[PDB]
Chains A and B, each alone.
With several copies, the nearest count.
Chain A
Amino acid sequence: IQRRLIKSMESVMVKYDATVRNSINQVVQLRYGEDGLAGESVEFQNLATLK
């Protein structure tokens, strides 16, 4: 399963126009994670006006 996933997504990359694209240059996401943010810097918080 790991090998299959890797070979399926290996060339998907964040481009300099900030879009996420595969090797064919097709657009997979207009911004990474729908927000264009890297996963190391984000963290858990609470929306104070929701509940």
Chain B
Amino acid sequence: DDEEETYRLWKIRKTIMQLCHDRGYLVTQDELDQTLEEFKAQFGDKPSEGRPRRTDLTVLVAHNDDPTDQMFVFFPEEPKVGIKTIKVYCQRMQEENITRALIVVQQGMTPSAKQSLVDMAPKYILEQFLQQELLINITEHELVPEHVVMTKEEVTELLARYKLRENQLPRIQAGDPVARYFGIKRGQVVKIIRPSETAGRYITYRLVQ
């Protein structure tokens, strides 16, 4: 009832740190591989009563390339997150001058809250995650190959080399589990490197949609 709760919180935090590291955010090795006992020491082992509260689990990382390009990770307390909570988080992001966030909900998120997450995109790119899908890092699965977000220079080089348009590459949905893991939007290309039994290695490129 409680030991499993802190176990889930630690696992979610571990997946979030791996996710931020894969997105290119500055994550120390110490928190990247944090043992469960270390998590209990740093946050507690009684989340039910309030040690740790999910508001204490909030993460704030900075991109390696730009220290000003930071990102939040919020852990709302309510299972079904409402529009008011989204407004509160957006208000906090405005105060701290942060433009990216992840919201790790427990049960879900209301339709109004999702519509709010969709409409104000050009201002704040804040994403929605279920705690159920952060208990595992899907990129470690054997079926999932190596995904790599290409830069606009790399995409231009690719289209110039193979002499093709973006609509001629294979596609990946914007709502794909791995696309959501890497936080990639439409127009971006992801390079997938997978092993091939006929060639050894194979690189394919999927455009986000």
Contact = CB atoms under 8 A, between A and B. Distances in A.
Are A and B in contact, CB atoms below 8 Å, in the complex? yes
Interface of A: 17, 19, 21, 24-31, 33-35, 37, 42
Interface in B17-51: none
Given A25-B168, A27-B168, A27-B169, A33 B198 contact: yes
B167 interface: yes
A26 B199 contact: no
Nearest to A26: B168
Interface residues of B, number: 13
Nearest to A39: B198
Nearest to B203: A30
24 contacts: A17-B162, A17-B163, A24-B168, A25-B164, A25-B168, A26-B167, A26-B168, A26-B169, A27-B162, A27-B164, A27-B168, A27-B169, A27-B170, A28-B170, A30-B162, A30-B204, A31-B199, A33-B199, A34-B198, A34-B199, A34-B202, A35-B198, A35-B199, A42-B198
Contacts, number: 33
Contacts of B164: 25, 27
B196 interface: yes
A19 B196 contact: no
Contacts of B169: 26-27
Given A27-B169, A30-B204, A42-B198, 10 more contacts: A26-B167, A26-B170, A27-B168, A27-B170, A29-B204, A31-B199, A33-B199, A34-B196, A34-B198, A37-B198
Interface in B150-209: 162-164, 167-170, 196, 198-199, 202-204
Contacts of A19: 162
Interface string B63-96: 0000000000000000000000000000000000
Nearest to B201: A34
Most B CB within 10 A of own CB, among A17, A24, A35: A35
Contacts of B204: 29-30
Contacts of A17: 162-163
Contacts of A24: 168
A41 to B, nearest CB: 12
Contacts of B163: 17
